């Protein structure tokens, strides 16, 4: 599985292995301050956020799950969501969430293994996607989540949760800034360090 660190060079090597043309490359997001965001090449189509699992995460996510089940949320049918059943798989799952939800922006090489995996898993349930990932030997190389734009909304994709989380309106053009605002919200949940990479045009 992808190592549990925010490392663009390793993640881009993985993208190449998986058969993606390198006109999208991960970059570091050096921090949330606007002059740091300006160093991220645009467009951006995904942000991966790395953070440690804490007791606060477990308590908050339980509250959030109850809230969403009670109020409902909009998760459009186009969102690709894969459950996590193996801890150390969260980096690889993050990468899959980033590519699956941006498939039409991507250029896949002929025998691309990730292209194959995506075509075969587009109609699977999140649970089936987890099982297939476990089976799929060609995908072989403290928590990661993905932030993407789908159909006008900003989705958080965390395979430890039961579903995507809708964080409000966004667009392809404003995804980086809107994702960073969601990261600021996340960090308010715990009285840490910011560690993120962005999938950027190259
Ligand atoms: C339920 C829930 C989450 O879903 C997420 C993403 C969280 C938290 C949480 O409770 C936190 O409490 C800490 C947090 C975090 C994010 C960025 C960072 O640099 C350091 C910490 O992220």
Numbering used by the authors: 6 to 146, 168 to 217, 220 to 230
Article sentences:
To elucidate how farrerol specifically binds to UCHL3, we crystallized UCHL3 in the presence of farrerol and determined the structure of the complex at 1.58 Å. The phenolic hydroxyl of farrerol formed hydrogen bonds with two amino acid residues, Lys187 and Arg215, in UCHL3. Here, using LiP-small molecule mapping (LiP-SMap) and surface plasmon resonance (SPR) assays, we identify UCHL3 as the direct target protein of farrerol, and the data revealed the strong affinity of farrerol for UCHL3 (Kd = 36.73 nM). We created two UCHL3 mutants, UCHL3–K187A and UCHL3–R215A, and then incubated farrerol with HEK293 cells that contained exogenously-introduced vectors in which UCHL3–K187A or UCHL3–R215A was expressed. In contrast to the UCHL3 WT, an improvement in thermal stability was not observed for the two mutants, indicating that farrerol directly binds to UCHL3 through the two amino acid residues. Further SPR assay with the purified recombinant UCHL3–K187A R215A mutant protein and farrerol confirmed that mutating the two amino acid sites abolished the binding of farrerol to UCHL3. Since the cocrystal structure of the UCHL3–farrerol complex revealed that farrerol directly binds to UCHL3, a ubiquitin–AMC assay was then performed to determine whether farrerol activates UCHL3 enzymatic activity, and we found that farrerol affected both Km and Kcat, by slightly increasing Km from 47.72 to 56.27 nM and significantly increasing Kcat from 11.99 to 19.64 s−1, suggesting that farrerol activates UCHL3 deubiquitinase activity. The in vitro deubiquitination assay revealed that farrerol promoted the UCHL3-mediated deubiquitination of RAD51 in a dose-dependent manner. Since we demonstrated that farrerol binds to UCHL3 through two amino acid residues to activate its enzymatic activity, in order to treat HR-overactivated cancer or overcome radio/chemo-resistance, it is likely worthwhile to try generating farrerol derivatives that exhibit an inhibitory effect on UCHL3 while still retaining a high affinity to UCHL3.
The deubiquitinase UCHL3 is a member of the ubiquitin carboxyl-terminal hydrolase (UCH) family, and it plays important roles in murine fertilization and preimplantation development. In response to DNA damage, UCHL3 is phosphorylated and activated by ATM, and activated UCHL3 positively regulates HR by deubiquitinating RAD51 to promote the BRCA2-RAD51 interaction. Here, we find that the deubiquitinase UCHL3 is the direct target of farrerol. Mechanistically, farrerol enhanced the deubiquitinase activity of UCHL3 to promote RAD51 deubiquitination, thereby improving HR repair.
